[PDB]
């Protein structure tokens, strides 16, 4: 936890200073890109996303969607796609509903924190207090369909925390999965499923609306929040497969599921389904 805490503080300083030093000694500027990402950050309210959804697709098929299930971290998958083509990749941030970047500054270890230690994501999210205040006042573990869209966020660390010689940019989509853990059995499997489907549909709608043809998804809400990885995989499958609303709408979707737990159960659930 202490090493991650140090890296987080370093990232915040880097975001403040607007530059960092790569392993080669190169001093890399990022202030312009961070500032652009912040100025371009938008909060989408649930009803707004619902409209983006009621403006449902109506296009043809330039190609059949490539779907991959990998053991990559979110950012490893994004970096790989980014090197392969020039269109900006979008990544789902498995967001805390209450704290921008989750517990990254305290050294917590989960996907949002990895994103926050490795990029300008915190500068974007910290600028949308309305998202966090809404949930603090709600005190309901289902949270809401609110989403933060963060365009062109600079990414400048690898999985090991090493600063990059050459940073790259991705868009982030920040949407909290329901806290199934706090809910327990007081909502039905089907109720949770409906919440997941509606919210995932809005994430996909926002991505498509902002012109992202390539996405990095994964086991959204399957950490501390305790969602069922099979149900989450099924949620995305219903949207992307068997003639679902987003079938054929993306060029490439990666379910990047790095699971250190024994048996990598989150990964297995996605590999099974896709």
């Amino acid at each position: 936890r202490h090493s991650r805490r140090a890296i987080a503080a370093e990232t915040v300083e880097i975001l403040e200073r607007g530059r960092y030093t790569a392993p080669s000694g190169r001093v890399v500027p990022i202030a312009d890109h961070v500032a652009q990402a912040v100025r371009g950050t938008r909060l989408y309210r649930p009803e707004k996303l619902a409209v983006l959804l009621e403006g449902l697709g109506a296009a043809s098929d330039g190609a059949p969607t490539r779907i991959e299930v990998t053991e990559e971290t979110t950012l490893a998958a994004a970096r790989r796609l980014t090197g392969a083509a020039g269109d900006q990749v979008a990544c789902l941030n498995f967001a805390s509903a209450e704290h921008p970047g989750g517990g990254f500054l305290s050294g917590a270890h989960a996907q949002e924190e990895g994103l926050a230690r490795s990029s300008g994501l915190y500068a974007s999210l910290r600028a949308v207090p309305q998202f966090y205040a809404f949930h603090h006042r709600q005190r309901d573990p289902l949270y809401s369909d609110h989403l933060i869209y963060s365009p062109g966020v600079p990414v400048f660390r690898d999985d090991a925390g090493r600063l990059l010689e050459e940073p790259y940019r991705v868009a982030f989509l920040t949407s909290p999965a329901p806290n199934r853990r706090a809910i327990g059995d007081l909502r039905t499997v089907e109720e949770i499923g409906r919440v997941l489907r509606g919210r995932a549909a809005k994430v996909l709608a926002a991505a498509r609306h902002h012109g992202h043809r390539r996405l990095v998804l994964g086991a959204w809400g399957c950490g501390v929040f305790g969602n069922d990885p099979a149900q989450v995989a099924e949620t995305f499958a219903g949207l992307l497969l068997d003639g679902g609303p987003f079938a054929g709408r993306f060029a490439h979707v990666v379910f990047a599921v790095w699971d250190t737990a024994p048996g990598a159960p989150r990964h297995a659930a996605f590999a099974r389904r896709f």
Side-chain angles (χ1 to χ4, degrees), residues 2-274:
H2 298 118
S3 54
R4 294 182 202 103
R5 185 184 172 181
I7 295 173
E10 186 205 346
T11 293
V12 165
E13 184 182 349
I14 286 168
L15 298 174
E16 292 292 322
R17 303 293 203 94
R19 57 183 29 96
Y20 68 86
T21 303
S24 68
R26 177 163 190 284
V27 182
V28 177
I30 62 170
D32 283 350
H33 289 170
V34 172
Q36 291 179 42
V38 174
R39 288 194 74 239
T41 294
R42 293 300 184 267
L43 175 56
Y44 290 76
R45 293 188 174 83
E47 74 269 15
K48 184 52 187 184
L49 296 160
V51 163
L52 290 187
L53 209 49
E54 280 307 311
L56 202 62
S60 295
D61 305 281
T65 305
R66 170 186 275 267
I67 304 176
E68 302 176 318
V69 180
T70 73
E71 306 195 51
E72 295 164 302
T73 64
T74 304
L75 289 178
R79 192 179 179 188
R80 166 164 140 275
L81 270 53
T82 297
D87 56 291
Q88 191 176 103
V89 175
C91 301
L92 174 61
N93 169 23
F94 306 166
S96 170
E98 302 187 14
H99 296 101
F104 87 115
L105 285 162
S106 299
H109 182 54
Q111 86 89 80
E112 175 166 36
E113 291 88 354
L115 302 183
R117 285 198 312 278
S118 306
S119 72
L121 176 61
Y122 175 63
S124 173
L125 302 182
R126 90 227 292 215
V128 191
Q130 286 186 64
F131 171 95
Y132 301 99
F134 177 86
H135 296 123
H136 281 285
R137 284 153 50 168
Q138 186 184 217
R139 288 175 47 101
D140 193 302
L142 282 173
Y143 307 130
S144 74
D145 296 339
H146 287 263
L147 176 151
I148 297 164
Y149 175 73
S150 306
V153 177
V155 180
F156 51 77
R157 292 192 199 268
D158 67 13
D159 289 341
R162 297 282 299 269
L163 294 163
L164 300 178
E165 295 299 329
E166 180 55 51
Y168 61 102
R169 290 189 288 178
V170 304
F172 287 106
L173 303 151
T174 292
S175 169
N179 182 1
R180 174 100 102 101
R181 181 233 190 96
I183 290 164
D185 69 340
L186 269 27
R187 300 276 183 173
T188 68
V189 171
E190 289 73 31
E191 291 180 315
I192 295 297
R194 290 188 201 91
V195 172
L196 285 169
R197 279 198 314 279
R199 198 165 296 169
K202 293 175 176 182
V203 169
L204 292 186
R208 154 108 158 176
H209 174 81
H210 279 97
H212 297 103
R213 318 267 300 103
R214 302 188 298 155
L215 306 184
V216 184
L217 303 178
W220 183 40
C222 296
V224 179
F225 281 3
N227 286 95
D228 178 358
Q231 185 175 49
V232 179
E234 180 56 43
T235 301
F236 289 121
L239 295 167
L240 296 164
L241 300 179
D242 195 31
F246 291 89
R249 286 204 194 295
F250 297 100
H252 190 173
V253 175
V254 180
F255 295 97
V257 193
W258 167 257
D259 200 353
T260 54
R266 275 128 277 185
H267 176 266
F270 282 79
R272 167 81 169 178
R273 184 64 184 85
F274 297 97

